[PDB]
Design a protein around this ligand. Structure first.
Ligand SMILES: CC(C)CCC[C@@H](C)[C@H]1CC[C@H]2[C@@H]3CC=C4C[C@@H](O)CC[C@]4(C)[C@H]3CC[C@]12C
Ligand SMILES: COc1cccc2c1cc([N+](=O)[O-])c1c(C(=O)O)cc3c(c12)OCO3
Lengths: 224, 338, 56, 286, 232
C-alpha cells in the first residue's frame, strides 16, 4: 500500500469503529411498530405514551429507549413497505372496543370492529411478521363500557350469544382478536384494555418489551 | 356518458390488441433457437462488504464503476470502494427507513428515499470535507421506491402514490410530474439517451415516459403481480421487469409487447432487483429465495446461480464496464461477483 | 367528476394506439446485433483475463 | 471388594455407552446441519466444542480401562500413568471450562440488568466467551504444573523407598474444579433470581409459561442432587472408609465419567433444537 | 475555511514553545493535519503529521523526537510542541489539512502561518530550472524530477503542485500529478512519464506569478522541491 492508501485504510477503520459505537448505543433502544384502524385510539396511545412520511415517537423507560414508528400517513396497499418493519421487536396494535356498534362511514355494511378484526388477521398471519410479538391495546374502554348497555353485541357478531355485560363482552372481543393467532407458539399477543386515561400503558409496554427480549434471548440460545 | 367513455376505451384496447397481434409474426424464441448457448456462467464473491447493521435495501454504482453506495435500514449510506474494501463515506440519515439510493453520474451527489417521502440529495464533494444534505425534495405523498439521476440538476423519482416526477435541483420543485399509474411504482430506469425511462409499478403494468414531453407513450402488461424491479436494455430500446409472480419479462419498445418470459417451475419466490449485463445478453435477477439467478436474455435458459446470501437479495448492481455485479441482500452484506 | 378521468384515459389510449410499431422479428434481429456487437466487450459473459481484472 | 469392583466395571461400561451416545448425537446432528448450510448460531458451536471435548475425555478414560484390563503390565511402567494424568488434566480442564463458558453465554444473554459492565458483556458475549476460554490457559497451565509436581513428588517418594499422594492430588483437583463450579453456581443463581423477578413482574401485569420453559429442568435438578450426594459419598469413602484402594481405579474412572457421560443427556434435554432432532430420530425409530 | 495559526516569535537557542493552529469552517476531526516549514528565503520541508484520531504519528528526521504533534478535536486546534530548538528551525511554519481518500485532494488548504526567529533514503525531488523569466500570455512549463519512480503499484501517481504568491501561503494546484484542485483556473495542467514531470501552464497572469513546488506523497518523508520561481 501507499501513503494515500494507508490513510484510506485508516479512514475506513475509523468509520467502522464509529458504526460499531453506533451499534453499541442502539443496543438498548428498541423498535416498535404502531398499527390500527381509523380513530381506533392510535393518537390516544401516542399522547399517553409520550407523557408526509412516517412519524416517530421516542420515549424512555428504565434504560429502554423505545422508538415507535407510526405509518398512518403514506397510505398504500401496505404489502409493499411492510418488509421494512420485519426486524421490529413488537407490534403495538390499537383496536377500538367501542367500534363494535359503530360502522364505517364510507360503508355502513362494513363494521369498523370487523375492519379492525380483518386487519389484525392480516398482521398476525403475515410473511414478515411470523415471529414479531404483538401488544394488543383495546382502547375506548369507557366508551365500550357505556355502549355495552346500549347496543347488543349480536348485531356485530352473529355468533354472539352471551349476556350484554361489560366484562363478558370485553373478553369476547379479546378472544375474537387473540384466536386469530393460528400459530400461537412463537408469537405471543399481550392484550390490555386501556381506557384512554390509564397512566400505566407505558408501564405495560415496558414489561411486555422486556418479556419479548427475554423470549428472543431464549430462542437464540435455544433453551425456549 | 361514462358508459360511452368506457365503451370507447374497450374498443381502443381491442384495436391495440389487434395491432399488437398483427405486428407479431415470430416470437423471440424462433429467431434465437439457432443462436449459440451462453454457457454456464460461474461467479465468485470477489469482495464482501461489511459494516451495515440492518437489511440493505438499495445499492448503486458510480460512473467510474469503482465506487458504490449502499442504503440500509439503520440510517447509514456508506459509499464503498469495490477495488479495495474501504468505507469512503458514511452519511447518517435522519430517515432511517430508506428504500432507494442513487449516485449522480458526475459522482458529486447521492440520494436516499424511503417511507419518509423525500429524495434527500447529499453533496459528496465539498470544501468542508464532510458529506451533508444538499436539499430535501418533499413533494411526494407516497413512499420513495426508486430514484435515478438524469444530471447534477435533474433527478427522476418514483413514489408509492402511483406518480413519478422530474425534479430540478436548483429550485427543488417538480419540473414535470408523471401520472397514469394505478399502483405502487417500484423501480425506474433512465435510458442511455437520458430521454426516456420505464416505470414498472404494482398494477402489473410498466409505463414508458419521455422526460421532456412528460406524457406516457407506451404501456406494457403481461404480468399478473406487482412489478418490483425494472432495468433498461443497454441498447436503450428494450427493458426487463421482475415481478412477484416469480417471472421476469423482456419488452421491446418498437413492437410494444412482451418478448420472453424468464420463468422456472422451481422458482416460486418473486424477483426484487433486476439488472442487465453490459452487452445485454445476460439478465441478472435478485430473487426472493436468498439467491441471484443469472438469465440469458436472448434465450430463456438459466445459466448461473449467485447463491451467496443468507437473506433476501434486495438490490442488484452491474458495473458500467460490466466488470462486477454487486448483490446487496438483507443479511447486511454486499458481495461483488465477477 | 369521473367523466374527466375517463376522458383522460381514452385520450391516453388514443396516443398509445397511434404510434407506429415494427415487426417483432426485426426487433429480435436488432437485439441480436447489439448482443453480438458488444459480446467481446462484456466481462461478465466473457471473463476478462485476471491481469486486467481489478477484483483479483 | 470383588463384587463392588464388578459393579463398578459394569456401570463404567454403561456410562461409556451413554456418553458415546450423547456426544455423538450432539456432534453429528450439528455436523449434519453444518454440511448442508443452515444458519449456525454460537451456542451450537460451543456445543460442538463441548461434545468433542467430552467424547475425547470418555475415549481417554475408556482407553485407561482397556489398558487396566488388557495390559496391566503397561501400568507397571507408570510412564503412561504420567501421560494419562497429564492428558486427563488438560481435557478435563477444557471440558469443564467449556461447560462454564456455555453457562456464561446463557447468563449473558438470558439475564437483564441495568449494570453497565453486564451490558458490555451482553453486547460482546462472543468475544467474552472466546477471551474466557483463552484466559483459562493460565489456569490450565497452573493445573498441569501442580499435578506434575505432585506426581514428581510421588515418584521421588517411591524412588527413595501411593494412596496418600493420590488422595492429595484428588483434593487439589477438587479445589481447582470447585473454582469453576463456584462461578457456574453463582451465575445460575443470578439467572434464577432474575427470572424470579421477571415472574413477579409478569404476575403483577399480564402473564410465565416460557419461564418454565427455560427452567425445563425435568431431570436437570434431579441429576445434580444425585451427582452431589454421589460425589460426597465417594469423597468420604476415599477419605476414611476401608477397601476402596483395591477398586480405586475403576471407581475413579466411573466417577470421572460423570460429567462426560450424563452431562450431555442434560444438554440434549435443555437444548430445544437438539431435542427436536432427538424427537425426529425417535419418530424414525418407530 | 480558515486555519489561522498562532505561537512562535523570538526564542533563545535550546528553548521551548507550543505552536497552535486553529481550525474553522470545516470538519477538523476527519482531516489529516500536517505541519510544514519554510526557511526565511528557501523552500518548504515537511515536519510533522497527525492523523484523524491521532492514530498515525510521523515526524521529519530533522525533528524526529525533538518535536511532538497533537490535535484537539473538541476545540479544533493543532499543536506542535518543541523542545531543544536549534538554529535550523527558523521557518515559516504552516498547518496543512489533508483529507484521507483517493478521488480527494490532500494538502487542499494551507493556513496563514506564524513567524519563528532563532538567534545564534527519502525521495529527493529537484527543479533545476529555478529562475524563469516569464511574460503574461505565454505558456510556460515547470519541470520536476523524482529520485524514485512515482508510479505506485495501484496505478496512482503521487505528485502535488503548489503556487506561492508573494507574502501568501501555498495553494494546491495539481494533486496526483494530473487532477486539478478546486478553485484553480483550468489553465493549469500536469503530465509526465512517472519519473520526470512537467506542470504546463497556459497564458500567464498576475495570479500565476510566484514560486512553484512539487511534493511526493508515496514515501511519507514528503520532500518538497527546491522551488521554481516565475518572475514577470
Ligand atoms: C469429583 C471431581 C473433583 C472429579 C475429580 C476426578 C479425579 C479425582 C479422577 C478422575 C480420573 C481419575 C484418574 C483415572 C485413572 C488413573 C490411572 C491410575 O493408574 C492412577 C489413578 C488415575 C490417574 C486416576 C486419578 C483420579 C482421577 C484423576
Ligand atoms: C444447558 O446447560 C444448563 C442448563 C441449566 C443448568 C445448567 C446448565 C449447564 C451447566 N454446566 O455448565 O454444566 C450447569 C452447571 C455446571 O456444572 O456448570 C451447574 C448448574 C446448572 C447448570 O444448573 C444448576 O447448577
Amino acid at each position: 500500500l501507499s501513503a494515500e492508501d494507508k490513510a484510506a485504510v485508516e479512514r475506513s477503520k475509523m468509520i467502522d469503529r464509529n458504526l460499531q459505537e453506533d451499534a453499541e448505543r442502539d443496543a438498548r433502544t428498541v423498535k416498535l411498530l404502531l398499527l390500527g384502524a381509523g380513530e381506533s385510539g392510535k393518537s390516544t396511545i401516542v399522547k399517553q405514551m409520550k407523557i408526509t412520511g412516517i412519524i416517530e415517537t421516542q420515549f424512555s423507560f428504565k434504560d429502554l429507549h423505545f422508538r415507535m414508528f407510526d405509518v398512518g400517513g403514506q397510505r398504500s396497499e401496505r404489502k409493499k413497505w411492510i418488509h421494512c418493519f420485519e426486524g421490529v421487536t413488537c407490534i403495538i396494535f390499537c383496536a377500538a372496543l367501542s367500534a363494535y356498534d359503530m360502522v364505517l362511514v364510507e360503508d355502513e355494511e362494513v363494521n369498523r370492529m370487523h375492519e379492525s378484526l380483518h386487519l389484525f388477521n392480516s398482521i398476525c398471519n403475515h410473511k414478515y411478521f411470523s415471529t414479531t410479538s404483538i401488544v394488543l391495546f383495546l382502547n375506548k374502554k369507557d366508551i365500550f363500557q357505556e355502549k355495552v348497555t346500549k347496543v347488543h353485541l349480536s348485531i356485530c357478531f352473529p355468533e354472539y350469544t352471551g349476556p350484554n355485560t361489560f366484562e363478558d363482552a370485553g373478553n369476547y372481543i379479546k378472544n375474537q382478536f387473540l384466536d386469530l393467532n393460528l400459530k400461537k407458539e412463537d408469537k405471543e399477543i399481550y392484550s390490555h384494555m386501556t381506557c384512554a386515561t390509564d397512566t400505566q400503558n407505558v408501564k405495560f409496554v415496558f414489561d411486555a418489551v422486556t418479556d419479548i427480549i427475554i423470549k428472543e434471548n431464549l430462542k437464540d440460545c435455544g433453551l425456549f | 356518458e361514462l358508459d360511452q367513455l368506457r365503451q370507447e376505451a374497450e374498443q381502443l384496447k381491442n384495436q391495440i390488441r389487434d395491432a399488437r397481434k398483427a405486428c407479431a409474426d415470430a416470437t423471440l424464441s424462433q429467431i434465437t433457437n439457432n443462436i449459440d448457448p451462453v454457457g454456464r456462467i460461474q461467479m465468485r464473491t470477489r469482495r464482501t462488504l461489511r459494516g451495515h447493521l440492518a437489511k440493505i435495501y438499495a445499492m448503486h454504482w458510480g460512473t467510474d464503476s469503482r465506487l458504490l453506495v449502499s442504503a440500509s435500514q439503520d440510517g447509514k449510506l456508506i459509499i464503498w470502494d469495490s477495488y479495495t474494501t474501504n468505507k469512503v463515506h458514511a452519511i447518517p440519515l435522519r430517515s432511517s427507513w430508506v428504500m432507494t439510493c442513487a449516485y449522480a453520474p458526475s459522482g458529486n451527489y447521492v440520494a436516499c428515499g424511503g417511507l419518509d417521502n423525500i429524495c434527500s440529495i447529499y453533496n459528496l464533494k465539498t470544501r468542508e470535507g464532510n458529506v451533508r444534505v444538499s436539499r430535501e425534495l418533499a413533494g411526494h405523498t407516497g413512499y420513495l421506491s426508486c430514484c435515478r439521476f438524469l444530471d447534477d440538476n435533474q433527478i427522476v423519482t418514483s413514489s408509492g402514490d402511483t406518480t413519478c416526477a422530474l425534479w430540478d435541483i436548483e429550485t427543488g420543485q417538480q419540473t414535470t410530474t408523471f401520472t397514469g399509474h394505478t399502483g405502487d411504482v417500484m423501480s425506474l430506469s433512465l435510458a442511455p439517451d437520458t430521454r426516456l425511462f420505464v416505470s414498472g409499478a404494482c398494477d402489473a403494468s410498466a409505463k414508458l415516459w419521455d422526460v421532456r414531453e412528460g406524457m406516457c407513450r407506451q404501456t406494457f402488461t403481461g404480468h399478473e403481480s406487482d412489478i418490483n424491479a425494472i432495468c433498461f436494455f443497454p441498447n436503450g430500446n428494450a427493458f426487463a421487469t421482475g415481478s412477484d409472480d416469480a417471472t421476469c419479462r423482456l419488452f421491446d419498445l418498437r413492437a410494444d409487447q412482451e418478448l420472453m418470459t424468464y420463468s422456472h417451475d422451481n422458482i416460486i419466490c418473486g424477483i426484487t432487483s433486476v439488472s442487465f449485463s453490459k452487452s445485454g445478453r445476460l439478465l441478472l435477477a435478485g430473487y426472493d429465495d436468498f439467491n441471484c439467478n443469472v438469465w440469458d436474455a436472448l434465450k430463456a435458459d438459466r445459466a448461473g446461480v449467485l447463491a451467496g446470501h443468507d437473506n433476501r437479495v434486495s438490490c442488484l448492481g452491474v458495473t458500467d464496464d460490466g466488470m462486477a455485479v454487486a448483490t446487496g441482500s438483507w443479511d447486511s452484506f454486499l458481495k461483488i461477483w465477477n | 367528476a369521473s367523466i374527466a378521468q375517463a376522458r383522460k384515459l381514452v385520450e391516453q389510449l388514443k396516443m398509445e394506439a397511434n404510434i407506429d410499431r415494427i415487426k417483432v422479428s426485426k426487433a429480435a434481429a436488432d437485439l441480436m446485433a447489439y448482443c453480438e456487437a458488444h459480446a467481446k466487450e462484456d466481462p461478465l459473459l466473457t471473463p476478462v483475463p485476471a491481469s486486467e481484472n481489478p477484483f483479483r | 471388594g470383588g463384587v463392588i469392583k464388578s459393579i463398578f466395571t459394569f456401570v463404567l461400561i454403561v456410562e461409556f455407552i451413554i456418553g458415546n451416545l450423547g456426544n455423538s448425537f450432539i456432534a453429528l446432528v450439528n455436523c449434519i446441519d453444518w454440511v448442508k448450510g443452515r444458519k449456525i448460531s454460537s451456542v451450537d458451536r460451543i456445543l460442538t466444542a463441548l461434545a468433542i471435548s467430552r467424547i475425547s475425555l470418555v475415549w481417554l478414560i475408556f482407553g485407561s480401562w482397556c489398558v487396566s484390563v488388557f495390559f496391566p503390565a503397561l501400568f507397571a511402567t507408570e510412564k503412561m500413568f504420567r501421560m494419562l494424568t497429564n492428558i486427563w488434566t488438560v481435557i478435563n480442564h477444557f471440558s469443564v471450562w467449556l461447560a462454564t463458558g456455555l453457562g456464561t453465554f446463557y447468563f449473558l444473554k438470558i439475564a437483564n440488568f441495568s449494570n453497565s459492565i453486564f451490558l458490555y458483556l451482553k453486547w460482546r458475549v462472543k468475544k467474552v466467551v472466546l477471551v474466557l476460554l483463552l484466559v483459562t490457559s493460565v489456569f490450565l497451565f497452573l493445573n498441569i504444573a501442580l499435578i506434575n509436581i505432585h506426581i514428581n513428588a510421588s515418584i521421588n517418594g517411591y524412588r527413595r523407598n501411593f494412596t496418600r499422594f493420590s488422595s492429595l492430588i484428588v483434593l487439589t483437583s477438587t479445589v481447582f474444579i470447585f473454582i469453576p463450579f463456584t462461578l457456574s453456581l453463582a451465575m445460575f443463581l443470578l439467572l434464577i433470581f432474575s427470572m424470579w423477578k421477571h415472574r413477579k413482574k409478569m404476575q403483577h401485569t399480564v402473564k410465565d409459561a416460557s419461564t418454565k420453559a427455560h427452567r425445563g429442568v425435568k431431570s436437570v435438578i434431579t441429576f445434580f442432587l444425585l451427582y452431589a450426594i454421589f460425589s460426597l459419598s465417594f469423597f468420604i469413602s476415599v477419605w476414611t472408609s476401608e477397601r476402596l484402594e483395591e477398586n480405586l481405579i475403576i471407581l475413579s474412572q466411573v466417577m470421572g465419567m460423570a460429567y462426560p457421560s450424563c452431562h450431555s443427556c442434560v444438554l440434549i434435554l435443555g437444548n430445544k433444537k437438539l431435542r427436536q432432532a432427538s424427537l425426529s430420530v425417535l419418530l424414525w425409530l418407530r | 475555511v480558515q486555519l489561522v495559526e498562532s505561537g512562535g516569535g523570538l526564542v533563545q537557542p535550546g528553548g521551548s514553545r507550543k505552536l497552535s493552529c486553529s481550525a474553522s469552517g470545516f470538519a477538523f476531526s476527519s482531516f489529516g493535519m500536517h505541519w510544514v516549514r519554510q526557511a526565511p528565503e528557501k523552500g518548504l520541508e515537511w515536519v510533522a503529521y497527525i492523523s484523524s484520531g491521532s492514530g498515525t504519528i510521523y515526524y521529519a528526521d530533522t525533528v524526529k523526537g525533538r518535536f511532538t504533534i497533537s490535535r484537539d478535536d473538541p476545540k479544533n486546534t493543532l499543536f506542535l510542541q518543541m523542545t531543544s530548538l536549534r538554529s535550523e528551525d527558523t521557518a515559516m511554519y504552516y498547518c496543512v489539512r489533508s483529507i484521507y481518500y483517493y478521488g480527494s485532494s490532500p494538502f487542499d488548504f494551507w493556513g496563514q502561518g506564524t513567524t519563528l526567529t532563532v538567534s545564534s533514503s527519502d525521495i529527493v525531488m529537484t527543479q533545476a530550472t529555478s529562475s524563469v523569466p516569464v511574460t503574461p500570455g505565454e505558456s510556460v512549463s515547470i519541470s520536476c524530477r523524482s529520485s524514485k519512480s512515482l508510479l505506485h503499484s495501484n496505478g496512482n501517481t503521487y505528485l502535488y503542485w503548489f503556487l506561492q504568491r508573494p507574502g501568501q501561503s501555498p495553494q494546491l494546484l495539481i494533486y496526483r500529478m494530473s487532477n486539478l484542485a478546486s478553485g484553480v483556473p483550468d489553465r493549469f495542467s500536469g503530465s509526465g512519464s512517472g519519473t520526470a514531470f512537467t506542470l504546463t501552464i497556459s497564458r500567464l497572469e498576475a495570479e500565476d506569478v510566484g514560486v512553484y513546488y512539487c511534493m511526493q506523497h508515496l514515501e511519507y518523508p514528503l520532500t518538497f522541491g527546491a522551488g521554481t520561481k516565475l518572475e514577470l
